[PDB]
Amino acid sequence: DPDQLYSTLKSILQQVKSHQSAWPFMEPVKRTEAPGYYEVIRFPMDLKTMSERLKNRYYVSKKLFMADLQRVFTNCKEYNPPESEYYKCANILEKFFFSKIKEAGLID
Ligand SMILES: CC(=O)Nc1ccc2c(C)cc(=O)n(C)c2c1
Numbered sequence: 001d002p003d004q005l006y007s008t009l010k011s012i013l014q015q016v017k018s019h020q021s022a023w024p025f026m027e028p029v030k031r032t033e034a035p036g037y038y039e040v041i042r043f044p045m046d047l048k049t050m051s052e053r054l055k056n057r058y059y060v061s062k063k064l065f066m067a068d069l070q071r072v073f074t075n076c077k078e079y080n081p082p083e084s085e086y087y088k089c090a091n092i093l094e095k096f097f098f099s100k101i102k103e104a105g106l107i108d
Contacts, residue, residue, distance in 0.1 A: 002060070009065050012100045013054060016069070017047050019096050021089040025072050034079070041079060045071040062108055069097060 016022060027048045029037050038044065050068050059065045076090040 005059070005062075006054070006057075008104050008106055009054060009059050009062075012065075012097075012104060012106070013047070013050060015100055016093065016097055017051075019093055021092040021096070022047060024076070024086050024089050025093070037079065041075050043071055043075070045069075045075060047072070062106055066101075 017026065025047050028044060028046050029041075031038065045068050050065075050072075053059060053068065054065075059068075073090045073094050076086050080086045
């Protein structure tokens with residue numbers, strides 16, 4: 001039951017991470033890549049941090065997992081213009097994310 005949730009979330013997270021549009025979101029944004037990012041974005045989130053959180057048994061609920069992954073997308077859209085490649089990646093990966101949640105039957 002806890003380990004079923006873990007398995008499902010691990011599968012979903014791995015699939016999201018393998019996706020071609022995930023490349024902007026794999027690790028914390030580097031100051032070198034985005035100087036002043038960390039003055040703007042108060043709650044940074046990325047897929048590596050999520051992987052660690054998962055391994056650390058933080059995601060005891062679907063809600064917690066969804067909030068972290070959604071934050072990845074909302075940070076991107078707050079920071080970047082709509083026609084930037086980063087914003088485009090976010091919406092493509094978000095579509096994929098939601099298909100994977102639905103496919104899994106993942107529910108509260
Ligand atoms: C690996 C990589 O190029 N990551 C980057 C670099 C720059 C940005 C910038 C500039 C914005 C942003 O939202 N993300 C997610 C980035 C990710």
